[PDB]
Amino acid sequence: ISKIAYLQDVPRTILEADVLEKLLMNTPRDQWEDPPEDTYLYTLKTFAEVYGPGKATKMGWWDYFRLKLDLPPGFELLDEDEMKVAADYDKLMMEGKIPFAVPGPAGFWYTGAVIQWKGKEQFAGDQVQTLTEN
Amino acid sequence: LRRELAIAYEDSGIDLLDNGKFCQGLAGADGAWGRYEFDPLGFSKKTELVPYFREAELKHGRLAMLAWVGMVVPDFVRIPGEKFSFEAVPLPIDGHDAFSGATGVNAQILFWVGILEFCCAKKVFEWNSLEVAGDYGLTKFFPSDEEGQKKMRTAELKNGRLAMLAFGGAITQAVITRHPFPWL
Amino acid sequence: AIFRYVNATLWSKAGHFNKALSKGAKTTTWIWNLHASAHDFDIQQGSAGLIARKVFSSGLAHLSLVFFWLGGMHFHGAYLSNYSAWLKDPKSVAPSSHIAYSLVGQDILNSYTSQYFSGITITSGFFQLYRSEGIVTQSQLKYACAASLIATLICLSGSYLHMQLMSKFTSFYKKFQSLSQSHLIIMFGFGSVSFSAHQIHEALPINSLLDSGIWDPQLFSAILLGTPSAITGKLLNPSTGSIFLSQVAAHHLAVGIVFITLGLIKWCNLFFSRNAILSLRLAYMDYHAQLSINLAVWASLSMVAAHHLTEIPVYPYESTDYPTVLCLFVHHACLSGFFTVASGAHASIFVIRQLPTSEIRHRDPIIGHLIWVCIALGLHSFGLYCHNDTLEALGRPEDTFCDNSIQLKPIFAKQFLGLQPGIEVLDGKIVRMTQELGTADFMVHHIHAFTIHVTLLILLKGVLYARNSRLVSDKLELGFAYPCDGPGRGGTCQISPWDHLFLAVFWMYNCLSVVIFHYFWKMQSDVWGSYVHHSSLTCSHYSQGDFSVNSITINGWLRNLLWSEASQVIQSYALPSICSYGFIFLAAHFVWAFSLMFLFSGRAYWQELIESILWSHHKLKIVPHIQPRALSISQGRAVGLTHYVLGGIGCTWAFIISRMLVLTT
Amino acid sequence: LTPAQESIAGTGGPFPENFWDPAGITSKKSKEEILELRAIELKHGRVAMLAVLGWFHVAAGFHIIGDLATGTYLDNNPLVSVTQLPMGGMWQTVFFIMCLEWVSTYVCPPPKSKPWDILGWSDILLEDEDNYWNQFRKAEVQELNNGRLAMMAIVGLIVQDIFFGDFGEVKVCFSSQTCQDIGDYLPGWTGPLPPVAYDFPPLYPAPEVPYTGYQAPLKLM
Amino acid sequence: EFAAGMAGSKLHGWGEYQFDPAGFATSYPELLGWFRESELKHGRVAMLAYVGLIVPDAFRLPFEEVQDSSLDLLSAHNKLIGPGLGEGPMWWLLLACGVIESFRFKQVGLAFESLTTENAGDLGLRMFAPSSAEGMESMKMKELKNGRLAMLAIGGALTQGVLFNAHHFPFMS
Ligand code: CLA
Ligand code: KC2
Ligand SMILES: CC1=C(C#C/C(C)=C/C=C/C(C)=C/C=C/C=C(C)/C=C/C=C(C)/C=C/[C@@]23O[C@]2(C)C[C@@H](O)CC3(C)C)C(C)(C)C[C@H](O)C1
Ligand SMILES: CC1=C(C#C/C(C)=C/C=C/C(C)=C/C=C/C=C(C)/C=C/C=C(C)/C=C/[C@@]23O[C@]2(C)C[C@@H](O)CC3(C)C)C(C)(C)C[C@H](O)C1
Ligand SMILES: CC1=C(C/C=C(\C)CCC[C@H](C)CCC[C@H](C)CCCC(C)C)C(=O)c2ccccc2C1=O
């Protein structure tokens, strides 16, 4: 966003515009101001504060190589659809509904059904709903 | 103009901002009658790697220029040796297999080329820039004018590309025909 | 990048990594904690970048260690081995790249392997591996050793460098898509294609010449030349008793192509069901999650290797090298078990340190049904053996479960190879023979299933009840490795995932011991042996086919397998070949018994005894200022477990190897 | 469509959103009749899916209950195996299915709104959930399409078996059938290489007279 | 929006198929006209390739150099290249095709500078054509569908004919 200094006119070499957009979308909004130390956004902030227009316009070959190694590529970050799917999954689980699955060979299949996992008594572990008994 | 490598290396390294020119204004994009900016796949959009791309292009052009002449000359003349004679090796395309392995004739060439490349890697990586890409200081006969230097660089690039394609054509034709120079 | 911060000053600090060890050496518990937490990089001083640095550099250092071990193996083969005699005549000469000194009469250990060589017979199959690779010269083995040493040096340098090359910004280890794609396409696909190329270009001509009988240097320095149209595996090399190496090379080419194709379709996004795995993708981006998954994968692959290396013969003469095949199977089965329990451990650690998946929220039904299936499996499977024992003792064989009596036919155990009738033989030995399944196989397989399920029960309970349980609700606060929560609530001993592993290791060892005994006895009785003369052969097996008649009873297992086949190891003292194996049998018994000390006793008795002993030292003015302490509870459990498993494994190792060595020579 | 027809709309035709009804059978029906028609369709589809599974299973061999009951290997043709089976087993099967039907229709009858809901999913299921992980319509349409295909397949198999004695023999090739040769495994194969009638000629000519250090290209032969 | 409004996505079986998994259209907008020209060229070459794979069995050209009855899809090109350079009927065909191609340079400039998305592949032939714009668009979609099918069909026919020696219409062993 415009209010963020280091996110303004980030040079394409340091990070591509599309990859930057994807990284910002993936990262929580509240972390844009001052991201945690171990994040791609933190690396981008630290290196954009030092490199770019009005600052060091050149870098050693090895320094640039390491920067491109430790910055994220586009395909590493989650997509819009993937983030939506994960958010829906978490929302379902927190609401007390379970996207039904049955264990299979060394895994479990999703049957495409949403069941009401929590029973009438929410805190009662005896009342969790299942097709076998409920 | 071209400055001495010592001065040119003052501003060297992976640039981050981009001169807004096609391929950062490097020579070799010039049509016969006008301007020919050939980059359909947009490789030059990686401005940081553009110097590396030009270094690689010039290396390939020079190597293929040598290789084409080395495919042409052997059939007309050979080293005065028994293992280089036309009877031992009929055509240049046979040289790789004839001299590979325990004979060491090609192993020595590979060894010396590897030593040279190990010594030049420092320039290739560290001291590479838009102005010193492909410049090893061997500027004898280089014109002392901006236009002359640009034209000489363009001629080198054009001949290098022509030989780059011509070596592929010649090697493929020679393998297909098992024939002397004309088909290579 | 800054290497001025690597100094030997910290070498003498001995505990710098752990902040809890700052008050250096007030007791011996400090020493023990130093050792225990040496490699627990997560809880050590620093940051996540440092954790990644240590993990990667340690992986590279271990890579260098393995390369050093392989180079040592190659050097021993080259200079301290009878590989020349074995290559010219594998059958007569047993593999031996191992020589012992003559210090205290220790030269007795070396046994006759060839006319000019005396040493210890190796059982790793390295000679067969060299023969398959086409290594037929001391120069070739020497250059392999040199390559291994160079790789060791390179890996050591890489570890040392990466300890500083990777900075806090380093993130290449979090690029899971890039990592997986690179490993799948290059490490596996290109690797398999390149090894197929190596086989085709080097091993195939050399192996064909060796099969023919040609040993000419010019020849040693036309694919599918000898292989007929017969399906691979349906026809073994008559002169070698193994799958054709050209078929193996074609296999590797096909596998590499398949791996490259899988990688390319993943690259193109052809795979579509990403959502079904997205939950795992988000949850398991953790060091311990990946470690657990990889450990389980490699455990399963090790078990499959153990089975296939024997059932499907691919190395020259390994089929007839009975000690080699047996040792390979047993070793890889043991590694499978160990890495599976490791996967359980690190699953528990991941659950403790990170948020678990949602299958933990109905953990009670899961573990309850697993408990029931374990109980039912154990009851039925082992009670069939107990029923057989009781009825046979009473004198009613007609009432027992056996082929002659009531029989439990394994109807589902059906063939898939479709082999031709008969067996495959090579110079007085049975390289390949079909295993005929009956009541004994049914019973033993269900015993296997029971033990596997109980081990899985222990591991899964530890994983699922790691964060909390009805007993204790703050197990997450307690952590991963704690002894208990107290004598309260009846007693909370061994409620931690660490203790759950401590028990799952016992159960894995029990399972693997039963598996080893089953494989050993079945192979000796029904597969291995010699033959006595369209021709029909009467096959004389080493155990005389007693598995199907005696294995139906626990007494039969005790008598015909342990007592009867311990004659070699028990009577090995005078024999030069296996006296070491007899001594190791005895010493492993001792160590196993010694483990019971720690497994049964408790901390307080030893602490009080130590204080009473220290009274005398103080009286005589011998005051150790690193105050002696009894081993912690978890350490006592760990020591007991280690000694128990080591002693049992040593007894089994010596017993089986002595039997095989004596029988084959 | 109609208000009654909408009770099942979205679960038919090639695409789920179509309503295939060339005969117009459901045009005049009421909602209860449409639900009963769907219940009949689903029961027939499920029975047909199980029937095809069992038919192929028995046509591959793998007919152990019959083998053990008769003390002999029953004919692979399922229609012949029916006659080869003992009346004991036949009446046991009929009685078991009768008991299943009685329990499902009298003891645990499905709701009138969802007559096809045998297992009572519509007591803990939330079909009208706006989450992405709610592909119950996809599951239902998959069920219906597979069941329809299985109905057609089983009718075709039975008709072809009755007419030309062809039961759609399966060539599983692992346990009941012992395939000795690569040709048996893959039709038309006779060797390691695929059976292509094209002799791959050399892309480049070779030297008639060789030279020292040639290393002529290898032949896969 | 999609591509450059070019025909080739509408009038499908279900109406609006937008086939572009690998985002070439978005990645190289400047090459969309070139892509359309290349697609139309490949389709119109594959149609004639199939028809000329079939017809030769029935008929042969008047000149006395293609009358051999063994000129199947496999040996035809190599046999007809003939000796030297610029001497065979294959060379006559190459020269004719080049003469035809050179008119496209007149139409869209020397360097295809004028090649746009709304004139890519259009050579100005308007004989036996729909009068209405909608009809013209429908015929362009027919043409694109037929060309894509002919490309796939000629690829399959050639591959099968060489692999299994069936060089004639069935193209099946
Ligand atoms: C038990 C059989 C059965 C039943 C009860 C139904 C019922 C239904 N189907 Mg139908 N359907 C069936 C089988 C059946 N289907 C099969 C096998 C197929 C595959 C071709 C389909 C394919 C299909 C589609 C694609 C769609 C439906 C739909 C419907 C619904 C509305 C149309 C209608 O009136 O159908 C009533 C059907 C009948 C009364 C069946 C009459 C059969 C006649 C008499 C011919 C039978 C001959 C047959 C070939 C066997 C000959 C064997 C002999 C030679 C030995 C309705 C609930 C629609 C829907 O659900 O929309 C939401 C819809 O779109 N069905
Ligand atoms: C991921 C989904 C997907 C897959 C995996 C897939 C695979 C195959 C295969 C290989 C297995 C073949 C051989 C094939 C062939 C055709 N597909 Mg198809 N296809 C998919 C999706 C769509 C969509 C959305 C449409 C479509 C179409 C056509 C047309 C007709 C075009 C026409 O005449 O307009 C033909 C010939 C369009 C249409 O209208 O079909 C009537 C259309 O809109 N496809 N398709
Ligand atoms: C002999 C031998 C060996 C070998 C070998 C070697 C060295 C082989 C080398 C092969 C080599 C070097 C092969 C080049 C190919 C170039 C191609 C295909 C160019 C195409 C170009 C195309 C299709 C188009 C180009 C243009 O469209 C562009 C892009 C823009 C336009 O404005 C202009 C044109 C239209 C022109 C061994 C292995 C060493 C030993 C062994 O014993 C046998
Ligand atoms: C599954 C799927 C799809 C797909 C797909 C896939 C996998 C498509 C693959 C297509 C593929 C693989 C197409 C090959 C063509 C090969 C050709 C044209 C070869 C010509 C060869 C020629 C012209 C050779 C000629 C000669 O050699 C001859 C014969 C004799 C010699 O003397 C002379 C010469 C050299 C001149 C859709 C449909 C795209 C979308 C859908 O959604 C999903
Ligand atoms: C014996 C015992 C002790 C006492 C054991 C101690 C203190 C171990 C002694 C450590 C010594 C000093 C380490 C040095 C190694 C051995 C002396 C090496 C001997 C090697 C021989 C070959 C000579 C415990 O503290 C304990 C705690 C909890 C559960 C069980 C037990 C337990 O069983």
XYZ file of N, CA, C and O in Angstrom, chain C residues 221-301:
324
model
N 38.682 -53.481 -21.012
C 38.912 -52.063 -21.258
C 39.236 -51.816 -22.728
O 38.352 -51.496 -23.523
N 26.009 -53.558 -28.023
C 25.148 -54.712 -28.258
C 24.368 -55.072 -26.999
O 24.617 -56.106 -26.378
N 23.422 -54.209 -26.625
C 22.595 -54.484 -25.456
C 21.572 -55.564 -25.795
O 21.256 -55.825 -26.961
N 21.050 -56.208 -24.750
C 20.084 -57.297 -24.903
C 20.677 -58.459 -25.693
O 19.957 -59.190 -26.379
N 21.997 -58.637 -25.606
C 22.660 -59.648 -26.421
C 22.202 -61.055 -26.053
O 21.949 -61.882 -26.936
N 22.087 -61.343 -24.759
C 21.787 -62.692 -24.317
C 20.401 -62.877 -23.732
O 19.968 -64.011 -23.511
N 19.694 -61.783 -23.478
C 18.395 -61.872 -22.821
C 17.336 -62.349 -23.808
O 17.170 -61.733 -24.867
N 16.604 -63.417 -23.511
C 15.527 -63.858 -24.397
C 14.281 -63.004 -24.191
O 14.280 -62.028 -23.443
N 13.207 -63.391 -24.873
C 11.932 -62.697 -24.756
C 11.222 -62.989 -23.442
O 10.175 -62.388 -23.176
N 11.754 -63.893 -22.623
C 11.123 -64.215 -21.351
C 11.002 -62.971 -20.480
O 11.913 -62.142 -20.419
N 9.858 -62.848 -19.806
C 9.635 -61.726 -18.905
C 10.776 -61.639 -17.904
O 11.296 -62.658 -17.436
N 11.174 -60.413 -17.573
C 12.195 -60.219 -16.553
C 11.712 -60.776 -15.221
O 10.562 -60.573 -14.823
N 12.602 -61.483 -14.528
C 12.273 -62.154 -13.295
C 11.768 -63.571 -13.481
O 11.914 -64.396 -12.573
N 11.177 -63.871 -14.637
C 10.739 -65.226 -14.944
C 11.875 -66.119 -15.419
O 11.695 -67.340 -15.478
N 13.027 -65.548 -15.760
C 14.183 -66.320 -16.200
C 15.429 -65.690 -15.602
O 15.769 -64.550 -15.933
N 16.104 -66.428 -14.729
C 17.326 -65.956 -14.099
C 18.540 -66.403 -14.902
O 18.507 -67.416 -15.605
N 19.616 -65.630 -14.790
C 20.879 -65.980 -15.425
C 21.269 -67.397 -15.021
O 21.579 -67.639 -13.849
N 21.266 -68.361 -15.946
C 21.618 -69.734 -15.551
C 23.001 -69.849 -14.942
O 23.208 -70.681 -14.050
N 23.956 -69.040 -15.392
C 25.324 -69.093 -14.896
C 25.565 -68.176 -13.705
O 26.662 -68.202 -13.137
N 24.580 -67.368 -13.314
C 24.730 -66.448 -12.193
C 23.566 -66.462 -11.214
O 23.748 -66.030 -10.070
N 22.391 -66.944 -11.608
C 21.256 -67.003 -10.709
C 20.774 -65.640 -10.261
O 20.525 -65.423 -9.071
N 20.639 -64.709 -11.202
C 20.157 -63.373 -10.887
C 19.526 -62.772 -12.131
O 19.793 -63.202 -13.256
N 18.678 -61.764 -11.912
C 18.030 -61.087 -13.026
C 19.088 -60.488 -13.939
O 20.143 -60.025 -13.484
N 18.811 -60.498 -15.239
C 19.770 -59.988 -16.208
C 20.062 -58.514 -15.949
O 19.146 -57.700 -15.778
N 21.349 -58.172 -15.931
C 21.734 -56.792 -15.679
C 21.261 -55.859 -16.783
O 21.059 -54.670 -16.528
N 21.070 -56.366 -18.004
C 20.467 -55.535 -19.042
C 19.019 -55.216 -18.704
O 18.552 -54.095 -18.935
N 18.294 -56.190 -18.150
C 16.948 -55.912 -17.666
C 16.979 -54.887 -16.543
O 16.114 -54.009 -16.473
N 17.975 -54.973 -15.660
C 18.095 -53.982 -14.589
C 18.349 -52.591 -15.165
O 17.784 -51.593 -14.697
N 19.224 -52.498 -16.168
C 19.515 -51.207 -16.784
C 18.280 -50.633 -17.466
O 18.004 -49.429 -17.364
N 17.531 -51.475 -18.180
C 16.280 -51.022 -18.774
C 15.311 -50.558 -17.697
O 14.594 -49.566 -17.877
N 15.282 -51.263 -16.566
C 14.445 -50.843 -15.451
C 14.815 -49.445 -14.991
O 13.941 -48.608 -14.750
N 16.111 -49.189 -14.822
C 16.532 -47.884 -14.328
C 16.230 -46.788 -15.340
O 15.827 -45.683 -14.962
N 16.402 -47.075 -16.630
C 16.035 -46.098 -17.651
C 14.546 -45.778 -17.581
O 14.143 -44.607 -17.611
N 13.711 -46.814 -17.469
C 12.269 -46.600 -17.402
C 11.883 -45.834 -16.143
O 11.014 -44.957 -16.183
N 12.511 -46.158 -15.013
C 12.203 -45.477 -13.759
C 12.594 -44.007 -13.843
O 11.860 -43.128 -13.379
N 13.762 -43.718 -14.417
C 14.157 -42.333 -14.586
C 13.209 -41.571 -15.491
O 12.853 -40.424 -15.209
N 12.777 -42.202 -16.585
C 11.822 -41.552 -17.477
C 10.513 -41.284 -16.746
O 9.910 -40.215 -16.895
N 10.048 -42.249 -15.951
C 8.794 -42.075 -15.223
C 8.916 -40.944 -14.211
O 7.995 -40.135 -14.050
N 10.041 -40.880 -13.496
C 10.239 -39.805 -12.528
C 10.280 -38.448 -13.217
O 9.695 -37.474 -12.726
N 10.968 -38.360 -14.357
C 11.013 -37.101 -15.095
C 9.615 -36.712 -15.555
O 9.232 -35.538 -15.501
N 8.833 -37.686 -16.026
C 7.475 -37.397 -16.472
C 6.605 -36.913 -15.319
O 5.813 -35.977 -15.480
N 6.727 -37.550 -14.153
C 5.973 -37.104 -12.986
C 6.350 -35.674 -12.621
O 5.481 -34.830 -12.363
N 7.650 -35.383 -12.608
C 8.086 -34.031 -12.313
C 7.559 -33.025 -13.316
O 7.163 -31.919 -12.947
N 7.535 -33.397 -14.596
C 7.089 -32.464 -15.625
C 5.586 -32.225 -15.549
O 5.124 -31.101 -15.770
N 4.804 -33.260 -15.244
C 3.365 -33.048 -15.099
C 3.078 -32.209 -13.860
O 2.171 -31.368 -13.862
N 3.846 -32.409 -12.785
C 3.712 -31.528 -11.627
C 4.079 -30.093 -11.991
O 3.417 -29.143 -11.560
N 5.136 -29.922 -12.788
C 5.541 -28.598 -13.247
C 4.431 -27.932 -14.048
O 4.153 -26.740 -13.871
N 3.788 -28.688 -14.933
C 2.685 -28.185 -15.739
C 1.375 -28.119 -14.968
O 0.377 -27.637 -15.515
N 1.349 -28.595 -13.723
C 0.175 -28.545 -12.859
C -0.905 -29.529 -13.289
O -2.082 -29.335 -12.974
N -0.524 -30.593 -13.999
C -1.511 -31.569 -14.449
C -2.225 -32.208 -13.267
O -3.441 -32.430 -13.314
N -1.492 -32.523 -12.203
C -2.138 -32.970 -10.978
C -3.091 -31.888 -10.492
O -2.742 -30.704 -10.457
N -4.299 -32.296 -10.114
C -5.381 -31.365 -9.835
C -5.845 -31.364 -8.389
O -6.248 -30.312 -7.890
N -5.799 -32.506 -7.702
C -6.315 -32.607 -6.337
C -5.277 -32.058 -5.357
O -4.698 -32.769 -4.533
N -5.041 -30.750 -5.470
C -4.182 -30.063 -4.514
C -4.902 -29.803 -3.199
O -4.266 -29.792 -2.141
N -6.217 -29.588 -3.251
C -6.958 -29.214 -2.052
C -6.978 -30.347 -1.035
O -6.919 -30.101 0.176
N -7.065 -31.593 -1.503
C -7.105 -32.723 -0.583
C -5.861 -32.780 0.291
O -5.911 -33.310 1.407
N -4.742 -32.244 -0.193
C -3.482 -32.263 0.544
C -3.085 -30.887 1.058
O -2.081 -30.782 1.778
N -3.832 -29.835 0.714
C -3.462 -28.489 1.142
C -3.389 -28.375 2.661
O -2.542 -27.648 3.195
N -4.279 -29.062 3.378
C -4.247 -28.998 4.835
C -2.923 -29.532 5.370
O -2.287 -28.908 6.229
N -2.483 -30.682 4.857
C -1.188 -31.221 5.260
C -0.059 -30.301 4.824
O 0.935 -30.144 5.540
N -0.191 -29.692 3.646
C 0.854 -28.803 3.158
C 1.041 -27.622 4.097
O 2.172 -27.206 4.373
N -0.062 -27.067 4.595
C 0.030 -25.945 5.523
C 0.516 -26.397 6.894
O 1.305 -25.698 7.540
N 0.059 -27.562 7.358
C 0.368 -27.986 8.719
C 1.806 -28.470 8.867
O 2.473 -28.139 9.853
N 2.304 -29.246 7.905
C 3.536 -30.008 8.066
C 4.736 -29.343 7.409
O 5.629 -30.034 6.911
N 4.778 -28.016 7.392
C 5.991 -27.314 6.984
C 6.884 -27.077 8.199
O 7.178 -25.949 8.586
N 7.294 -28.172 8.837
C 8.082 -28.131 10.059
C 9.233 -29.118 9.961
O 9.144 -30.141 9.273
N 10.313 -28.808 10.680
C 11.470 -29.695 10.698
C 11.080 -31.090 11.159
O 11.422 -32.087 10.515
N 10.355 -31.180 12.273
C 10.035 -32.486 12.833
C 8.964 -33.202 12.024
O 9.002 -34.429 11.911
N 8.017 -32.467 11.443
C 7.048 -33.103 10.557
C 7.746 -33.740 9.365
O 7.494 -34.904 9.026
N 8.641 -32.988 8.720
C 9.363 -33.532 7.577
C 10.266 -34.682 7.994
O 10.377 -35.679 7.274
N 10.915 -34.567 9.152
C 11.769 -35.645 9.630
C 10.966 -36.913 9.875
O 11.392 -38.006 9.494
N 9.794 -36.787 10.498
C 8.953 -37.951 10.751
C 8.489 -38.585 9.447
O 8.549 -39.810 9.278
N 8.017 -37.763 8.509
C 7.518 -38.301 7.247
C 8.638 -39.010 6.498
O 8.460 -40.122 5.984
N 9.813 -38.381 6.429
C 10.935 -38.986 5.726
C 11.398 -40.260 6.416
O 11.739 -41.242 5.749
N 11.423 -40.268 7.749
C 11.836 -41.467 8.465
C 10.881 -42.618 8.191
O 11.316 -43.754 7.986
N 9.576 -42.346 8.179
C 8.617 -43.400 7.861
C 8.775 -43.880 6.423
O 8.716 -45.089 6.153
N 8.984 -42.951 5.487
C 9.165 -43.332 4.089
C 10.375 -44.244 3.947
O 10.316 -45.291 3.290
N 11.489 -43.866 4.574
C 12.706 -44.656 4.445
C 12.612 -45.961 5.219
O 13.213 -46.955 4.812
N 11.847 -45.996 6.310
C 11.607 -47.256 7.004
C 10.857 -48.232 6.111
O 11.226 -49.409 5.996
N 9.788 -47.758 5.470
C 9.027 -48.626 4.578
C 9.873 -49.070 3.394
O 9.821 -50.238 2.984
N 10.664 -48.156 2.829
C 11.530 -48.526 1.717
C 12.595 -49.520 2.158
O 12.969 -50.412 1.393
